[model samples]
Target: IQRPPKIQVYSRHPPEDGKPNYLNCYVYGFHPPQIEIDLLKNGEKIKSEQSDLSFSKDWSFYLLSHAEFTPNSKDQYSCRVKHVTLEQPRIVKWDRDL
Candidate 1:
């Protein structure tokens, strides 16, 4: 069976002066399934977040109020999906500085 597409997050503006930043996550899947996302900082779990969807369509999920990453903060972001017989997890690191 075909698995869901990989989820990715992008930042409109990088953090500056140790301030919070906004991010957008895009989720793609062939079948409709619940998607869960989380933000991590310095290898510590901050909070668990989810997205709301009406129909099974390729769309983007906006994640606001993410942990502010400073020049010295070790910022890391990841996303996961739970589908039928498919449990694949994909993770990506946030680039420091704009």
Candidate 2:
């Protein structure tokens, strides 16, 4: 059996106003059960939450938006996926002083 590919995102700097900070994540062999995006600050969860994308059997791409991020704040962002068949989870993170 083939396992689904993991997805993740990272940024070198905090997103700035009037500029776009792009983070990319990929899922391979994707099939049902979706993927989720979450933001954390110093390991603490943030209120803004996003739902997982519907699964596809083909590889999928995702881009996250942090449009209102403040210039100075504590931040550590991560993205994850919970597989439908395997019940396994995959996660990735990007940390920065904002």
Candidate 3:
């Protein structure tokens, strides 16, 4: 069965303005293991690295895509996910408020 991915976008640590940090997008709980994940800054694509595909006990797949970033009050960061199960790309934004 095909399943849509659940996505999370966040920093490796508490974001400090102008300080180097890791921006991560974790997409999980999907099946078929075919998905596209991208890290974005200000609605544009940013270069990122992805972990090897893996599965949980139930066989749901997961992938982690991340990039080196420096967060600031002015920029918007987000993760975009695409999978066969999804009608459209899922966009999850990083919450600076968290």
Among these predicted structures, which one has the highest lDDT? 3
Report the poorest 10 consecutive residues by lDDT, candidate 2. Answer: 63-72
70-89, model 1: which lDDT tens digit per residue? 43344455444344435565
Q: Model 2, stretches more than 4 Å misplaced?
A: 1-3, 11-29, 47-67, 71-74, 85-88, 95-98
Give candidate 3's root-mean-square deviation (CA, Å).
1.2
RMSD of each: 4.2, 5.5, 1.2
Go through the candidates in order and give each one's C-alpha lDDT: 0.49, 0.47, 0.89
Clashing pairs in 1: none
Residue pairs with colliding backbones in model 3 are none
**Quick one: best TM-score, which candidate?**
3
Candidate achieving higher TM-score, 1 or 3: 3
Task: Tell me the lDDT of candidate 3.
Answer: 0.89
